[PDB]
Design a protein around this ligand. Structure first.
Ligand SMILES: NC(=O)c1ccc[n+]([C@@H]2O[C@H](COP(=O)([O-])OP(=O)(O)OC[C@H]3O[C@@H](n4cnc5c(N)ncnc54)[C@H](OP(=O)(O)O)[C@@H]3O)[C@@H](O)[C@H]2O)c1
Length: 321
């Protein structure tokens, strides 16, 4: 992995951009000539192959965390998979040519980059990246980081460990599909229960849920069964706290959290992906793509519209970029 020739890396590229906060249908525009970010010394430049969308992209674009956001205009997109083309002088873990993936923003809600993954090139901290598993496509790899790390961190915060039971509220989304798989296949849960609507229950069982609960037909919190861990991915901590065992833990990713539930926001770390690599290589944990994926780079507004419907099954990915 010798340095690319310098003339070979462009200083402008195509990207999606918004210059004011609002709905993606209103503010998100294609710009054919946006600056390529200059890398810091602990960053790499990536030729983007694929990018995933996350709810945070549209919540950010609505201005929900303007006080700690980076300055507009913004090129959105947290999740990336692609090929390193340049490395900073302090980088030791990657070289030119490495295939990598990660969630660009260490702290999602505090100073996320101005130069996201919905662009031909992006700059990424070494610390957020991992080597792409050889058996995963770039679409599949891009689908993973933010969701799989959020799943992992929430389960660790809830102290899940072998033999325990877990209930997942929102099993069929980007995050929930990983909460199920990790709980069963990485944390050794004895029983995994999860909620979704009627047509999504077989998917939950396929991913590792022992009990798939149709929230449109029954109320999980009224079941006599109580769980060691409850992981809310839908914003119903009021009910989640009613489904936990005394001494158990409830975590949510959608606040506000009703004590004793806690809310957290993930910390993006390549080391988490690296820890998960064997499960990804063996297929014990699988990417989960929405049937509408991939969306071409021309169709980013449509991809966001679909995510914003709250009905995505696994991940919405944009490819080819
Ligand atoms: N705090 C953090 O660090 C963090 C990190 C990631 C995500 N988040 C937040 O967590 C939430 C989930 O993100 P995500 O990427 O997984 O979203 P997503 O992929 O858009 O979630 C879509 C899924 O939600 C399901 N769903 C909707 N309402 C439901 C309900 N009442 N019960 C059960 N399932 C329900 C839908 O299944 P049905 O069609 O069957 O309803 C759909 O499959 C978002 O609000 C996001 O902002 C927070």
């Amino acid at each position: 992995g010798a340095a690319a020739p310098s003339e070979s890396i462009p200083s402008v590229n195509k990207a999606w951009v918004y210059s004011e906060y609002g709905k993606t249908s209103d503010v998100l525009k294609f710009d054919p000539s946006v600056a390529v970010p200059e890398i810091k010394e602990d960053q790499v430049l990536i030729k983007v192959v694929a990018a995933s969308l996350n709810p945070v992209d549209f919540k950010r674009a609505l201005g929900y965390f303007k006080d700690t956001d980076s300055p507009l205009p913004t090129i959105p997109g947290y999740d990336v998979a692609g090929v390193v083309v340049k490395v900073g002088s302090q980088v030791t873990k990657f070289k030119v040519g490495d295939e990598v993936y990660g969630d660009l923003n260490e702290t999602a809600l505090v100073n996320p980059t101005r130069f996201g993954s919905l662009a031909e090139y992006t700059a990424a901290d070494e610390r957020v990246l991992a080597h792409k598993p050889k058996n995963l496509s770039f679409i599949e790899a891009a689908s993973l980081p933010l969701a799989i790390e959020t799943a992992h961190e929430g389960l660790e915060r809830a102290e899940l460990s072998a033999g325990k039971s877990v209930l997942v509220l929102g099993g069929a989304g980007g995050v929930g599909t990983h909460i199920i798989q990790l709980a069963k296949h990485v944390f050794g849960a004895s029983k995994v229960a999860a909620t979704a609507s009627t047509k999504k229950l077989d998917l939950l069982r396929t991913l590792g849920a022992d009990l798939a609960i149709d929230y449109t037909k029954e109320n999980f919190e009224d079941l006599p069964e109580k769980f060691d861990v409850v992981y809310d991915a839908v914003g119903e901590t009021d009910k989640a706290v009613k489904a936990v065992k005394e001494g158990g833990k409830v975590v949510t990713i959608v606040g506000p959290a009703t004590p004793p539930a806690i809310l957290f926001v993930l910390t993006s770390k390549g080391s988490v992906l690296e820890k998960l690599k064997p499960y990804l290589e063996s297929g014990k944990v699988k990417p989960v793509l929405d049937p509408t994926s991939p969306y071409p780079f021309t169709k980013v507004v449509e991809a966001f519209g679909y995510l914003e419907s709250s009905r995505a099954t696994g991940k919405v990915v944009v490819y080819p970029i």
